[PDB]
Every structure is written in C-alpha cells, then in structure tokens.
Amino acid sequence: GVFNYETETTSVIPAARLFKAFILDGDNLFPKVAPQAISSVENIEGNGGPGTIKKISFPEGLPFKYVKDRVDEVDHTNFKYNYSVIEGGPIGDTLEKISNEIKIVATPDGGSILKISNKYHTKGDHEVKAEQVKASKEMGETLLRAVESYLLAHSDAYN
Amino acid sequence: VQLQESGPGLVKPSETLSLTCSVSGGSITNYFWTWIRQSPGKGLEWIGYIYYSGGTNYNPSLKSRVTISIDTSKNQFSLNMNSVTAADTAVYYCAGSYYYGVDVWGQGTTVTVSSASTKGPSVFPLAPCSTAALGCLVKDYFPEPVTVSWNSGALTSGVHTFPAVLQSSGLYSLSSVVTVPSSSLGTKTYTCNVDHKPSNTKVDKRV
Amino acid sequence: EIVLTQSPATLSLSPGERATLSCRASQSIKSFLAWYRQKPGQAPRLLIYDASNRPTGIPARFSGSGSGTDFTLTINSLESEDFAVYFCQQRNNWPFTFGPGTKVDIKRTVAAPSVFIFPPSDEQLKSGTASVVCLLNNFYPREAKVQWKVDNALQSGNSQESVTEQDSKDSTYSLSSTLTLSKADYEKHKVYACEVTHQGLSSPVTKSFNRGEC
Ligand SMILES: *[C@@H]1O[C@H](CO)[C@@H](O)[C@H](O)[C@H]1NC(C)=O
C-alpha cells in the first residue's frame, strides 16, 4: 500500500543558493556539517543526475547502518529533486521503497520554502509506525539546519 | 548578537532548574541555541541544543530529565532540568552555536543546588590607619556569586576582587581591593558596589 | 560518549615562545575538533574550528592541525594576555564532548609583593567578630608565606587566604590573608602585625597597627 506524507518549513536562505548547497552539493556538505548524522555520502553509480545511486553511510549507534538512494529527477531551474530510497535501512519485507520529492521555492522576504513529500510503498498492506516517519522528519530538520547554519557561517559559500 | 541569562541561582534538591536566555542584536534564526554547564567535578558539559524549528537534541546523561524549549516570538529559549541534585551545581552558559562550534556565549549564571536558604552578605570597609590601597570585605553570604565594582564602575584600573573562600561557618566570604595614589585620598571619593543577586541585595559601602 | 584527553595539564611558558597543546580522542573524530580559550571569569571563546580553520577575528598566531585521534593547538609568540585554559571539543558524535583543559601559565621574573594591612572596621566590631586583613599586591612567583602575629604570637588556624589568577597584563599574583577572631579576643591585645616572607624580598617585611590608635 501507498501512504502519503507532507511537511512544509522555511529557511532564511534564498531558494537558489539553498538548492545549490542543500541539494546539488549535499553529498559534500552532509558529512561535513552533520557528521553526527551522516558519516559519508558515496556516489556508487552515476553522474550525479538521474539514474545515480548514492550510498549514504550512517555512524554506528544510529538505528540503521546505511541506505542506498536513486536519483530520479534534478530540476536545476524550478528547484525540484525527486529521489527514491531503494535499499538499506527500513527497507525490506515490510517496506518496498520510499519515494521523496523536495521542492524549494523563494519567498518575497528573501527566504525560501521547503515542500517535502514522502511516499511510502509498503509491500502488502502493512502500516508505517511513526518512528520511521519521526526519524525522517528529524533527519530532514537536522540536515536542513546544518547546511543552513553552514551558509550563515560562510556568507561567501555558494554565491 | 547578545545573550543574557536570567534564572534562580538557588534550586532545592529534587525540584526543577529553570533558566531562560534572551537573544538580542541578531535574529533567532542565526544559531543552534545551546545550553552548556561548567562544574569543577565534571568540567565543560554539553546539556543540549535547539533549532529555531523546535528540534531538540539532549545529552544522554541528562536527556532523562532535561527539556529545552524555544519561543521564537519573544526571541527566547529556555532550559528545564528537574530532579536536580548537588551533582547539578554548576555555572550554566546559554549560547548560540554554528555547525562548527559555539560562536557566542552568555555571561553564565551560577546555580547552586542546596537545601539551605539565602543569606545576603555583610559589607565592611577596608582602610588604613606613595601608593595606597582600599578595599571592601564581603563576608558571610550564600550562595555564590557576588559582584563588586568600585565607584559605579568608574574605578577599574588596579582593582583586585579575590576568589571567594568557604569559611568553616558554611558561608562564603571574599574581599575586593584597589590601589590608588596617596595624593588623591582626601580629594576623590571611593565606594564599592556589592551585588548579591540570589539574596536580592545591593550594598554601596563608602570608604 | 567520545572521551577527549588533553596533554599536558599545565605548561608554563615565557611570552614570545611557541605554545603547543595536544588533544587526543578515544575514537576517530575525522576533522571535527574545535579549540576554545577561557580567560578567568569569562565564557570560552572559540579559536580553531574543524581542527585547522580559524573563525573571523581570531589572529593568525593561532593555528591547529591533526586528524583522527591526535590534534594539536599552536600559539605563536605568546602574550601575557594569553594566560587562560584551552579546551578541545569533538563534534563527530553526539553528545559533543570537551577535554579536561590545558592551563597556560605565563613565566615572569621575580617581583616583590607590596604589603598592606587593614584594621577591622567599627561597623564590624559591633557584630561581635573581628577580621584583620593583609594584602600582598602584584607579586611573583605564586608562593608566599603570610605569618600573623598578635603581640608577637604566631597565629594558627584562624586565618584563610585567597589568591587571584595570573594577571593578563603583568602576569603577577595578589593574595589576601583574613585573620578572623572574636571581638573579645581582639580587644585583649594591642599589636597586630602581618609578616610576609617572599622570594622577591631580601628579608621578611612586616606591616602592623596598634588597636587603640585606629
Ligand atoms: C517522485 O517520483 C516517484 C517515483 O519514484 C513518484 O511515484 C512520485 O509521484 C514523484 N513525486 C512527484 C511529486 O513528482
């Protein structure tokens, strides 16, 4: 079964400057700004763009060791990034995949908005405990504010 | 960016520690708002930090009894540690952190966990009978700290305010001194300002 | 939690020398080490972040290096104002943890103390207790011997001392010895002296007063 999740938040960073850092160069930043959450983001197969398979390795002590994601779309113009979690972590018998779309839109006051949609494809008709959803919301908040804090500490970075 | 602590300096055992920090000179969005304490036994200890989005992160040794809250509208964030014991007596720093470390700090507020009540100090003048020294003796107070300034902060050069010494009575005691020229003794006025916030005591003593 | 070890606990260097502090982590913190300075009575100030980089405003005479489990902080051309305790902090795994701190004391030539004595105030004698204070101002080294004498009696167990931290400018110490008595004991003697034996004094120096003459 498919179970749909949505969440919206804001950042003080402009949409373009945030998309360049939080999405395009997120492989570099996430182990650098939030090492307590992500140890490394290995790019197993691909050219960054669609079809790419990243290996996000986690520090030992977190509930999961790693996950492997697949890049589905990188919209450099409208600031969209749809990717799918396909292996590792919560994925297995009771969950097929987690498809995620992140869009960043600019706000008039110079900031930005993050629309975050989660699409959980459960095998059969199993439920999804909030612990997995709560872990994803906390993970998104942690990485967003870490890159945000990095972009505030270095006003030069990413133009 | 400015941070000012405000909270009780005396908390009785098993009751709840409560501290609040006011952010000014900068937006509530800038930092990871952080609580750090410093005790002689345990050194520098990370209590936790909160984003302006509400996401908290607590030290496992204290996550059992620590909640950190933020109110972005009043530009404030708070610390609440309940069931406090003597192992929680420390100087507590509210601070703002970037991803790389603590960038700006508060003044630090000294919390003493004790079963005892507050006693304000007794302030007595220290005076003699080319260089000359004057002083004040801040005696018999609890808990810590007290702050001493001379002539409403105008006299700063040559000031020595000593570490407080625990007397056998169980109360603290310290003295503050300053050296001046002997020539300006009869001309200029000298006054020490002793502030003991836990007892809500301010004593301007003239020498 | 990751446990940080700092070596040495204390080092004493003259101004102008190079200070080399060390930090060791029980596990690998890749490059996520920070160095803080805490001058006495103040909140710590960050000096090095992510083990080699330098936040804006920190002078170029501070630098850090290292990776994995061993990092070092280096201070070129020490100032007397550099007297403080320096801590290292890892941010690799929550909880972020500090080191026990390395205290940098500033070497100085010997300096003789200035000895002052203070009678008990009239306002205090009405309390029923007497505190006669002795001040040793702006001396070095730290060690000194305050001997209390009433009518040439060597006092014991009725006096406490407090010592300031090392001064940021001239790297000197200051000491106060407070001789606490009762009002009755104070009134039954006349001569109160403070004898100071210090390394900067060719011979011990005494300051005193007479009880009835103040
Ligand atoms: C993102 O891609 C997945 C395919 O993995 C798709 O099911 C989902 O509808 C897409 N979301 C959006 C917002 O286009």
Coordinates of C-alpha atoms and ligand atoms in Angstrom, one line a residue:
Chain A
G1 CA 0.0 0.0 0.0
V2 CA 0.9 3.6 -0.6
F3 CA 0.9 6.1 2.3
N4 CA 1.3 9.8 1.7
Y5 CA 3.2 12.2 3.9
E6 CA 3.6 16.0 3.6
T7 CA 5.5 18.7 5.5
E8 CA 6.5 22.3 4.9
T9 CA 9.1 24.5 6.5
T10 CA 11.1 27.7 5.9
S11 CA 14.7 28.8 5.6
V12 CA 16.3 32.2 5.7
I13 CA 18.5 31.2 2.7
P14 CA 17.4 32.2 -0.9
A15 CA 15.9 29.4 -2.9
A16 CA 18.7 29.2 -5.5
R17 CA 21.6 29.5 -3.0
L18 CA 19.9 26.8 -0.8
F19 CA 19.2 24.5 -3.7
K20 CA 22.8 24.7 -4.9
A21 CA 24.1 23.7 -1.4
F22 CA 21.3 21.6 0.2
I23 CA 20.6 19.6 -3.0
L24 CA 23.3 19.7 -5.6
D25 CA 26.3 19.7 -3.3
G26 CA 24.5 17.8 -0.5
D27 CA 26.9 14.9 -1.0
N28 CA 29.8 17.1 0.1
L29 CA 28.0 19.0 2.9
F30 CA 26.0 16.4 4.8
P31 CA 29.1 14.5 6.2
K32 CA 30.8 17.9 6.8
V33 CA 28.0 19.9 8.5
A34 CA 26.2 17.0 10.2
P35 CA 28.8 14.2 10.9
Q36 CA 26.8 13.0 13.9
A37 CA 24.0 12.0 11.5
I38 CA 25.8 11.1 8.2
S39 CA 29.3 9.7 8.0
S40 CA 29.7 9.7 4.3
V41 CA 27.7 10.0 1.1
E42 CA 29.3 7.7 -1.5
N43 CA 28.2 8.0 -5.1
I44 CA 28.3 4.3 -6.1
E45 CA 27.0 4.5 -9.7
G46 CA 26.1 7.5 -11.9
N47 CA 26.9 11.1 -12.9
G48 CA 25.0 12.9 -10.1
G49 CA 21.9 13.2 -12.3
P50 CA 19.0 10.8 -12.9
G51 CA 19.9 7.2 -12.6
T52 CA 22.6 7.9 -9.9
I53 CA 22.8 5.6 -6.9
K54 CA 24.1 7.1 -3.7
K55 CA 25.2 5.2 -0.6
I56 CA 24.6 7.3 2.5
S57 CA 26.5 5.6 5.3
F58 CA 25.5 6.4 8.9
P59 CA 27.6 6.4 12.1
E60 CA 27.4 3.2 14.1
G61 CA 24.9 3.7 17.0
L62 CA 22.1 5.0 15.0
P63 CA 19.2 2.5 14.4
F64 CA 20.4 1.8 10.8
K65 CA 23.8 1.4 9.2
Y66 CA 23.1 2.8 5.8
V67 CA 20.7 3.4 2.9
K68 CA 21.1 3.5 -0.9
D69 CA 19.1 6.1 -2.8
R70 CA 18.4 6.6 -6.5
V71 CA 18.2 9.9 -8.2
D72 CA 15.1 10.3 -10.3
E73 CA 15.0 14.0 -11.3
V74 CA 17.2 17.0 -10.7
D75 CA 15.3 20.2 -11.9
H76 CA 18.1 22.8 -11.9
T77 CA 15.6 25.5 -12.9
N78 CA 12.4 25.0 -10.8
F79 CA 14.5 23.7 -7.8
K80 CA 13.0 20.2 -7.6
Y81 CA 14.7 16.9 -6.6
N82 CA 12.8 13.7 -6.7
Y83 CA 14.7 10.6 -5.4
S84 CA 13.8 7.2 -4.1
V85 CA 15.2 5.1 -1.2
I86 CA 15.5 1.6 -2.6
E87 CA 17.9 -0.4 -0.3
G88 CA 19.1 -0.5 3.3
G89 CA 17.7 1.0 6.5
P90 CA 13.9 0.4 6.9
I91 CA 13.6 -1.2 3.5
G92 CA 12.9 -4.9 3.4
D93 CA 10.0 -7.3 3.8
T94 CA 7.5 -4.8 5.3
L95 CA 8.5 -1.8 3.1
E96 CA 9.3 -1.7 -0.6
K97 CA 10.7 1.8 -1.2
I98 CA 10.4 5.4 0.0
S99 CA 9.9 7.9 -2.9
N100 CA 10.7 11.5 -1.9
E101 CA 10.2 14.8 -3.7
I102 CA 11.8 18.0 -2.3
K103 CA 10.9 21.4 -3.9
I104 CA 12.4 24.7 -2.8
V105 CA 10.5 27.9 -3.7
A106 CA 11.6 31.5 -2.9
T107 CA 9.7 33.8 -0.5
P108 CA 9.3 37.5 -1.1
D109 CA 11.2 38.4 2.1
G110 CA 14.4 36.8 0.6
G111 CA 14.0 33.4 2.2
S112 CA 12.7 30.1 0.9
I113 CA 10.1 27.3 1.5
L114 CA 10.8 23.5 1.5
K115 CA 7.9 21.3 0.4
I116 CA 8.8 17.7 1.4
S117 CA 6.6 14.9 0.3
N118 CA 7.1 11.3 1.4
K119 CA 5.5 8.3 -0.5
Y120 CA 5.9 5.0 1.4
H121 CA 5.3 2.0 -0.8
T122 CA 4.5 -0.8 1.7
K123 CA 4.6 -4.4 0.5
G124 CA 1.2 -6.0 1.1
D125 CA -0.9 -3.8 3.5
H126 CA 1.5 -3.2 6.4
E127 CA 1.3 0.0 8.4
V128 CA 4.1 2.5 8.9
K129 CA 4.9 3.3 12.6
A130 CA 5.5 7.0 13.2
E131 CA 9.0 6.1 14.5
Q132 CA 10.2 5.7 10.9
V133 CA 8.3 8.9 9.9
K134 CA 9.5 10.7 13.1
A135 CA 13.1 9.6 12.2
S136 CA 12.8 11.0 8.7
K137 CA 11.3 14.4 9.9
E138 CA 14.1 14.7 12.5
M139 CA 16.7 13.8 9.8
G140 CA 15.4 16.4 7.4
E141 CA 15.4 19.1 10.1
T142 CA 18.9 18.2 11.2
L143 CA 20.4 18.3 7.7
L144 CA 18.5 21.4 6.7
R145 CA 19.6 23.5 9.7
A146 CA 23.1 22.2 9.5
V147 CA 23.5 23.3 5.9
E148 CA 21.6 26.5 6.8
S149 CA 23.9 27.2 9.7
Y150 CA 26.9 26.5 7.3
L151 CA 25.5 29.0 4.8
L152 CA 25.0 31.6 7.6
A153 CA 28.5 31.0 8.9
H154 CA 30.1 31.3 5.4
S155 CA 28.2 34.0 3.5
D156 CA 30.6 33.5 0.6
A157 CA 29.8 29.9 0.0
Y158 CA 27.6 29.1 -3.0
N159 CA 27.5 32.7 -4.1
Chain B
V1 CA 24.4 39.2 18.9
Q2 CA 23.8 39.3 22.6
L3 CA 22.7 36.7 25.2
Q4 CA 21.6 37.4 28.8
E5 CA 20.9 34.6 31.3
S6 CA 18.1 35.0 33.8
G7 CA 17.1 32.4 36.4
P8 CA 17.3 31.3 40.0
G9 CA 20.8 30.9 41.4
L10 CA 19.5 28.6 44.2
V11 CA 17.4 25.4 43.5
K12 CA 16.4 23.0 46.2
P13 CA 17.1 19.3 45.7
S14 CA 14.7 17.3 43.6
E15 CA 13.0 20.5 42.4
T16 CA 13.2 21.9 38.9
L17 CA 16.0 24.0 37.5
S18 CA 14.6 26.7 35.1
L19 CA 16.7 29.1 33.1
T20 CA 15.9 31.5 30.2
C21 CA 18.1 33.2 27.7
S22 CA 17.2 36.4 25.8
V23 CA 18.6 36.9 22.3
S24 CA 19.2 40.4 21.0
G25 CA 21.3 42.1 18.3
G26 CA 20.6 39.3 15.9
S27 CA 17.8 37.1 14.6
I28 CA 16.6 33.9 16.3
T29 CA 17.5 32.1 13.0
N30 CA 21.2 32.5 13.2
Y31 CA 22.4 29.9 15.6
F32 CA 21.8 26.5 17.2
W33 CA 20.7 27.7 20.6
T34 CA 22.7 25.9 23.2
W35 CA 22.9 25.2 26.9
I36 CA 26.3 24.3 28.4
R37 CA 27.3 24.0 32.1
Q38 CA 30.7 24.1 33.8
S39 CA 31.4 22.4 37.1
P40 CA 34.7 21.7 38.9
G41 CA 33.9 18.0 39.1
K42 CA 32.7 17.5 35.5
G43 CA 34.4 20.3 33.5
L44 CA 32.6 21.6 30.4
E45 CA 29.4 19.6 29.7
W46 CA 27.0 19.9 26.8
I47 CA 23.5 19.9 28.0
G48 CA 21.7 20.2 24.6
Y49 CA 20.8 22.5 21.8
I50 CA 17.6 23.5 20.0
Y51 CA 17.0 24.7 16.4
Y52 CA 14.6 27.6 15.8
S53 CA 12.4 24.9 14.2
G54 CA 11.9 23.3 17.6
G55 CA 14.1 20.3 17.0
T56 CA 16.0 19.5 20.3
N57 CA 19.0 17.3 21.0
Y58 CA 19.8 16.3 24.5
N59 CA 22.9 14.7 26.2
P60 CA 22.0 11.1 27.1
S61 CA 23.4 11.5 30.6
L62 CA 20.8 14.3 31.1
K63 CA 18.1 13.5 28.5
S64 CA 16.2 11.6 31.2
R65 CA 15.3 14.9 32.9
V66 CA 16.1 17.8 30.6
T67 CA 13.7 19.7 28.2
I68 CA 14.8 22.7 26.1
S69 CA 12.1 25.0 24.7
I70 CA 12.2 28.0 22.3
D71 CA 9.8 30.8 21.8
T72 CA 10.7 32.5 18.5
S73 CA 8.2 35.3 19.0
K74 CA 9.8 36.6 22.3
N75 CA 13.3 35.7 20.9
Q76 CA 13.9 33.5 23.9
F77 CA 14.9 29.9 24.7
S78 CA 14.7 28.0 28.0
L79 CA 16.3 25.1 29.9
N80 CA 14.3 23.0 32.3
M81 CA 16.2 20.4 34.4
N82 CA 14.1 18.7 37.1
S83 CA 15.1 16.4 40.0
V84 CA 18.3 18.4 40.5
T85 CA 20.9 17.2 43.0
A86 CA 24.2 18.5 44.2
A87 CA 25.8 17.0 41.1
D88 CA 24.0 19.7 39.1
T89 CA 25.6 22.7 40.9
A90 CA 27.5 24.4 38.1
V91 CA 27.8 27.6 36.1
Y92 CA 25.3 27.4 33.3
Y93 CA 26.0 29.1 29.9
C94 CA 23.3 29.8 27.4
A95 CA 25.0 30.1 24.0
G96 CA 24.5 30.2 20.2
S97 CA 26.3 27.7 18.1
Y98 CA 27.1 27.4 14.4
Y99 CA 27.6 23.9 12.8
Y100 CA 31.2 24.1 13.8
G101 CA 31.1 25.1 17.5
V102 CA 29.8 27.7 20.0
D103 CA 30.2 31.1 18.4
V104 CA 28.6 33.4 21.0
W105 CA 28.1 32.9 24.7
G106 CA 26.0 34.3 27.6
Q107 CA 27.5 35.7 30.8
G108 CA 26.9 32.5 32.7
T109 CA 24.7 32.1 35.7
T110 CA 25.8 30.2 38.8
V111 CA 23.2 27.6 40.0
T112 CA 23.7 26.2 43.5
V113 CA 21.7 23.1 44.4
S114 CA 21.3 23.3 48.2
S115 CA 18.8 22.6 51.0
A116 CA 19.7 25.9 52.6
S117 CA 18.2 29.4 52.3
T118 CA 19.9 32.5 51.0
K119 CA 21.9 34.9 53.2
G120 CA 22.9 38.3 51.9
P121 CA 26.4 39.5 52.7
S122 CA 27.8 41.9 55.3
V123 CA 30.0 44.5 53.7
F124 CA 32.7 46.3 55.8
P125 CA 35.3 48.9 54.7
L126 CA 39.0 48.1 54.4
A127 CA 41.1 51.3 55.0
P128 CA 44.5 52.1 56.6
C129 CA 45.1 53.8 59.9
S130 CA 53.1 56.9 47.9
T131 CA 50.7 54.1 46.8
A132 CA 47.7 53.4 48.9
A133 CA 45.2 50.6 48.8
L134 CA 41.5 50.5 49.8
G135 CA 39.0 47.6 49.9
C136 CA 35.8 46.0 51.0
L137 CA 35.2 42.7 52.8
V138 CA 32.1 40.8 51.5
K139 CA 31.6 38.4 54.4
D140 CA 29.1 35.6 55.3
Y141 CA 27.0 35.1 52.2
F142 CA 25.3 32.2 50.4
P143 CA 25.0 31.0 47.7
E144 CA 27.5 32.3 45.2
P145 CA 28.1 34.6 43.4
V146 CA 28.6 38.3 44.4
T147 CA 29.9 41.0 42.1
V148 CA 32.0 44.0 43.2
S149 CA 32.5 47.3 41.3
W150 CA 34.2 50.5 42.5
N151 CA 32.6 53.9 42.1
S152 CA 29.8 52.6 39.9
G153 CA 32.3 51.0 37.5
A154 CA 34.3 54.2 37.1
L155 CA 37.3 52.8 39.0
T156 CA 38.6 49.8 37.1
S157 CA 42.4 50.1 37.0
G158 CA 44.2 48.4 39.9
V159 CA 41.1 46.5 41.1
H160 CA 41.5 43.1 42.6
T161 CA 38.4 41.1 43.6
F162 CA 39.5 37.8 45.1
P163 CA 38.1 34.3 44.7
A164 CA 35.5 33.6 47.4
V165 CA 36.7 31.4 50.3
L166 CA 34.4 28.9 52.0
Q167 CA 34.6 29.6 55.7
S168 CA 34.1 27.0 58.4
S169 CA 30.7 28.5 59.1
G170 CA 29.4 27.1 55.8
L171 CA 29.0 30.6 54.3
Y172 CA 31.3 32.2 51.7
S173 CA 33.5 35.3 52.2
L174 CA 35.6 37.4 49.9
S175 CA 37.3 40.8 49.8
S176 CA 37.9 43.3 47.0
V177 CA 40.8 45.8 46.9
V178 CA 42.1 48.6 44.8
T179 CA 45.3 50.7 44.9
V180 CA 45.2 54.4 44.3
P181 CA 47.7 57.3 44.7
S182 CA 48.1 58.6 48.3
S183 CA 47.7 62.1 46.9
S184 CA 44.0 61.5 45.8
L185 CA 42.8 60.0 49.1
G186 CA 41.2 63.1 50.7
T187 CA 40.1 64.5 47.3
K188 CA 38.3 61.7 45.4
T189 CA 35.5 59.6 46.8
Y190 CA 35.7 55.8 47.0
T191 CA 32.7 53.4 47.1
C192 CA 32.4 49.7 46.4
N193 CA 29.2 48.3 45.0
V194 CA 28.4 44.7 46.1
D195 CA 25.6 42.9 44.3
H196 CA 24.4 39.5 45.6
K197 CA 21.5 38.6 43.3
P198 CA 20.4 35.4 45.0
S199 CA 19.5 37.4 48.1
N200 CA 18.4 40.5 46.0
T201 CA 21.0 42.5 48.0
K202 CA 22.9 45.6 46.8
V203 CA 25.1 47.4 49.3
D204 CA 27.0 50.5 48.3
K205 CA 29.7 50.9 51.0
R206 CA 31.8 54.0 51.3
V207 CA 35.4 54.1 52.2
Chain C
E1 CA 30.5 9.4 24.6
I2 CA 33.9 10.1 22.9
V3 CA 36.4 10.9 25.6
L4 CA 39.0 13.7 24.9
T5 CA 42.3 13.7 26.6
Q6 CA 44.5 16.8 26.8
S7 CA 48.3 16.9 27.4
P8 CA 49.8 18.4 29.3
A9 CA 47.5 19.6 32.1
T10 CA 49.7 22.6 32.8
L11 CA 52.5 24.3 30.9
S12 CA 54.4 27.4 31.9
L13 CA 56.0 29.5 29.1
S14 CA 57.6 32.9 28.7
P15 CA 55.9 35.4 26.4
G16 CA 57.3 35.2 22.8
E17 CA 57.7 31.4 23.0
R18 CA 55.6 28.9 21.0
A19 CA 52.9 27.0 22.9
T20 CA 52.0 23.5 21.7
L21 CA 48.8 22.0 23.3
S22 CA 47.6 18.5 22.5
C23 CA 44.2 16.8 22.3
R24 CA 43.6 13.0 22.0
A25 CA 40.3 11.3 21.2
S26 CA 39.3 7.8 22.3
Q27 CA 37.9 7.2 18.8
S28 CA 38.4 8.8 15.4
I29 CA 37.0 12.2 15.1
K30 CA 37.8 12.8 11.4
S31 CA 38.5 16.5 11.4
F32 CA 35.8 17.7 13.8
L33 CA 37.8 19.2 16.6
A34 CA 37.5 22.8 18.0
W35 CA 39.7 24.7 20.4
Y36 CA 38.4 27.2 22.9
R37 CA 40.1 29.7 25.2
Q38 CA 38.7 30.6 28.6
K39 CA 40.3 33.5 30.3
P40 CA 39.4 33.6 34.1
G41 CA 35.9 34.5 34.9
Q42 CA 34.7 34.6 31.3
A43 CA 32.9 32.3 28.9
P44 CA 35.1 30.3 26.5
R45 CA 35.9 31.8 23.1
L46 CA 36.3 29.6 20.0
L47 CA 39.7 29.8 18.4
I48 CA 40.0 26.9 15.9
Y49 CA 37.1 25.1 14.3
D50 CA 37.1 21.7 12.4
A51 CA 40.7 21.2 13.7
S52 CA 42.5 23.7 11.4
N53 CA 40.2 26.5 10.3
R54 CA 40.2 29.9 12.0
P55 CA 37.0 31.9 12.6
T56 CA 36.9 35.6 11.5
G57 CA 38.7 37.8 14.0
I58 CA 41.0 35.2 15.6
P59 CA 44.6 36.3 14.9
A60 CA 46.8 34.3 12.6
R61 CA 49.2 33.5 15.5
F62 CA 46.7 30.7 16.5
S63 CA 46.6 27.5 14.4
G64 CA 45.6 23.9 14.7
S65 CA 46.3 20.7 12.9
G66 CA 45.7 17.0 13.1
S67 CA 43.2 14.3 12.1
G68 CA 41.8 11.0 13.5
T69 CA 42.7 10.8 17.2
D70 CA 45.6 13.3 17.6
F71 CA 45.3 17.1 17.2
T72 CA 47.4 20.0 18.4
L73 CA 46.9 23.7 19.0
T74 CA 49.8 26.1 18.4
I75 CA 50.1 29.6 19.8
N76 CA 53.0 31.6 18.2
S77 CA 54.5 34.5 20.2
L78 CA 52.6 34.1 23.4
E79 CA 51.4 37.2 25.1
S80 CA 50.8 37.7 28.8
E81 CA 47.1 38.1 27.8
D82 CA 47.2 34.5 26.5
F83 CA 47.0 33.3 30.1
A84 CA 43.9 31.0 30.1
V85 CA 42.7 27.4 29.9
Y86 CA 42.3 26.0 26.4
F87 CA 39.8 23.2 25.8
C88 CA 39.3 20.9 22.8
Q89 CA 35.9 19.7 21.6
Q90 CA 34.8 17.0 19.3
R91 CA 31.6 17.3 17.2
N92 CA 31.8 14.0 15.4
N93 CA 29.3 12.1 17.5
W94 CA 26.6 13.5 19.8
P95 CA 26.9 14.2 22.6
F96 CA 29.6 16.7 21.8
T97 CA 32.3 16.5 24.4
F98 CA 35.2 18.6 25.8
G99 CA 38.6 17.9 27.1
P100 CA 39.7 18.5 30.7
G101 CA 41.6 21.7 29.7
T102 CA 45.2 22.8 29.5
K103 CA 46.2 25.8 31.6
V104 CA 48.8 28.1 30.1
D105 CA 50.7 30.0 32.8
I106 CA 52.9 32.9 31.8
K107 CA 56.5 32.9 33.0
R108 CA 57.8 36.1 34.7
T109 CA 60.8 37.4 36.5
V110 CA 60.5 37.5 40.3
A111 CA 58.6 40.5 41.6
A112 CA 58.4 41.6 45.3
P113 CA 54.9 42.0 46.9
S114 CA 53.5 45.3 48.2
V115 CA 52.3 44.6 51.8
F116 CA 49.2 46.4 53.2
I117 CA 47.3 45.9 56.4
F118 CA 43.7 46.7 57.3
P119 CA 42.2 47.2 60.8
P120 CA 38.7 45.8 61.4
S121 CA 36.0 48.4 60.8
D122 CA 33.9 49.9 63.6
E123 CA 30.8 48.7 61.8
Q124 CA 32.1 45.1 62.1
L125 CA 33.2 45.3 65.7
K126 CA 29.5 45.9 66.6
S127 CA 28.8 42.5 65.0
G128 CA 30.9 40.7 67.7
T129 CA 33.6 39.5 65.3
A130 CA 36.9 40.9 64.1
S131 CA 38.6 40.4 60.7
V132 CA 42.0 41.9 60.1
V133 CA 43.1 41.6 56.5
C134 CA 46.6 41.6 55.0
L135 CA 47.2 42.3 51.3
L136 CA 50.2 41.2 49.2
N137 CA 49.8 43.1 45.9
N138 CA 51.3 42.3 42.5
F139 CA 54.0 39.8 43.2
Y140 CA 55.6 36.7 41.5
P141 CA 56.0 33.8 41.9
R142 CA 52.8 32.5 43.4
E143 CA 54.3 31.0 46.6
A144 CA 54.4 33.3 49.7
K145 CA 54.3 32.9 53.5
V146 CA 51.9 35.1 55.4
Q147 CA 52.6 34.9 59.1
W148 CA 50.2 36.5 61.5
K149 CA 51.5 37.9 64.8
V150 CA 49.5 39.4 67.7
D151 CA 51.8 40.8 70.4
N152 CA 54.5 38.6 68.8
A153 CA 52.4 35.4 68.9
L154 CA 52.4 33.1 65.9
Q155 CA 48.8 32.6 64.8
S156 CA 47.4 29.3 63.6
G157 CA 44.1 28.0 62.4
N158 CA 42.2 31.4 62.5
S159 CA 43.2 32.8 59.1
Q160 CA 42.4 32.0 55.5
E161 CA 43.9 33.1 52.2
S162 CA 42.7 33.8 48.7
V163 CA 44.9 34.2 45.6
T164 CA 43.9 35.9 42.3
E165 CA 44.6 34.3 39.0
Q166 CA 47.6 35.4 37.0
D167 CA 47.2 38.9 35.7
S168 CA 46.6 39.3 32.0
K169 CA 49.0 42.3 31.7
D170 CA 51.9 41.9 34.1
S171 CA 51.4 38.2 34.9
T172 CA 51.5 38.8 38.6
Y173 CA 49.5 37.4 41.5
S174 CA 47.8 39.1 44.5
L175 CA 47.0 37.5 47.9
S176 CA 44.8 38.4 50.9
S177 CA 45.0 36.7 54.3
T178 CA 42.0 37.3 56.5
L179 CA 42.5 36.8 60.2
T180 CA 39.1 36.2 61.8
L181 CA 38.7 36.4 65.6
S182 CA 36.0 37.2 68.2
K183 CA 35.5 40.7 69.5
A184 CA 36.6 39.8 73.0
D185 CA 39.9 38.2 71.7
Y186 CA 40.6 41.2 69.5
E187 CA 40.1 43.7 72.4
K188 CA 42.5 41.9 74.8
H189 CA 45.6 42.5 72.6
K190 CA 47.1 45.7 71.1
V191 CA 49.8 44.9 68.5
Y192 CA 48.6 43.2 65.2
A193 CA 51.3 42.6 62.6
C194 CA 51.5 40.8 59.2
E195 CA 54.8 39.2 58.3
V196 CA 55.4 38.3 54.6
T197 CA 58.2 36.0 53.5
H198 CA 58.6 36.0 49.8
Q199 CA 61.2 35.1 47.2
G200 CA 61.4 38.7 45.9
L201 CA 62.2 40.1 49.4
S202 CA 65.7 40.2 50.7
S203 CA 64.2 39.7 54.2
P204 CA 60.6 39.3 55.5
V205 CA 58.5 42.5 55.5
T206 CA 56.1 43.4 58.3
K207 CA 53.2 45.8 58.3
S208 CA 51.2 46.4 61.5
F209 CA 48.9 48.7 63.5
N210 CA 48.0 49.4 67.2
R211 CA 44.5 48.6 68.2
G212 CA 43.9 51.8 70.1
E213 CA 45.4 54.1 67.5
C214 CA 43.0 53.4 64.7
Ligands
LIG1 C1 8.6 11.2 -7.4 O1 8.9 10.0 -8.1 C2 8.2 8.8 -7.7 C3 8.8 7.7 -8.4 O2 9.8 7.0 -7.6 C4 6.7 9.1 -8.0 O3 6.0 7.9 -7.5 C5 6.2 10.3 -7.3 O4 4.9 10.6 -7.7 C6 7.1 11.5 -7.7 N1 6.7 12.7 -6.9 C7 6.4 13.9 -7.5 C8 6.0 15.0 -6.6 O5 6.6 14.0 -8.7

